[PDB]
């Protein structure tokens, strides 16, 4: 029947970007009219696909990826970009066929004096390859000095909280993000437009 996207966009609570969530939509019909005629969204950047032509199309599988970041960082939910998120938490390929959406969530994800439940990963030995996901808490050895325990400026915790406060500024206020990825394979196309 209807493809379950309201369970993805209307989730009571989302996840941290380093631990990003993927939900696969399959064998169903969807009107994206909920999505694109909306006006409640900050970010609506589509790649390889007109979002207005989505109901006239069929795909083999659809992947809804959801997470939370700041607004200064959405730019990074984009093809071919760099920085803390793109390089170490969530990567989009240059060959992205899909759409990316976000909106302010300062009313759901912030707390007076800091909401710490949202974390991003500060560093990795290498850059995350497309669609990769990393949840490791391995003490990061900055100083190239043997690391045991956890110590100082030379051994570091790789994750950082966002400390969301409602009184923060918009680029520092919370944004829920949904990456909708649309795939055509050499097999049957279940996920289609209403018409």
């Amino acid at each position, epitope marked *: 029947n209807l493809c379950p996207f309201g369970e993805v966009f209307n989730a009571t609570r989302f996840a941290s970007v380093y631990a990003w969530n993927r939900k696969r939509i399959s064998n169903c019909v969807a009107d994206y009219s909920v999505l694109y005629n909306s006006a409640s969204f900050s970010t609506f950047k589509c790649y390889g696909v007109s979002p207005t032509k989505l109901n006239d199309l069929c795909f083999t599988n659809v992947y809804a990826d959801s997470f939370v970041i700041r607004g200064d960082e959405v730019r990074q939910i984009a093809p071919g970009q760099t920085g*803390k998120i793109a390089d170490y938490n969530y990567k989009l390929p240059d060959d992205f066929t899909g759409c990316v959406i976000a909106w302010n969530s300062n009313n759901l994800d912030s707390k007076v*004096g800091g909401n710490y439940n949202y974390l991003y990963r500060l560093f990795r030995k290498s850059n995350l390859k497309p669609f990769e996901r990393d949840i490791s808490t391995e003490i990061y050895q900055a*100083g190239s000095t043997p690391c045991n325990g956890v*110590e100082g*400026f030379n051994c570091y915790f790789p994750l*950082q909280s966002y*400390g969301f*406060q409602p009184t923060n500024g918009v680029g*520092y206020q919370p944004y829920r993000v949904v990456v909708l990825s649309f795939e055509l394979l050499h097999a049957p196309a279940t996920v289609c437009g209403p018409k």
Partner: nanobody
Amino acid sequence: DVQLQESGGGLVQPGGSLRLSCAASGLTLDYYAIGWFRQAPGKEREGVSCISSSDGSTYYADSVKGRFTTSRDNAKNTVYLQMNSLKPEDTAVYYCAAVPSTYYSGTYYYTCHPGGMDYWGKGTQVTVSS
């Protein structure tokens, strides 16, 4: 709405001492960290000291150890750096920064990252010569 003013710094000679000072504004945070950073000429930014807000816990960069120390007077919301046996390579523009602490699973960690702090300040200059 967090503002920070670093104060202190001048020409000091070798073996010398100076004491720096951050000014803290708007922290409304419950668990935070304040860092001292420095950027020498033509080199990258480096961290000198971190203090936790909960207990005042502190860490230091290796070379800085034994000489520089960090304290807090909660009242003026100021954080300091007692610089004490100055050397020429300690010449730099020194910096304040603020950061949220991180609470993974109720295990508290505080990280002062030159790559990653939320709030920063203009800077203070410390020169060490004869």
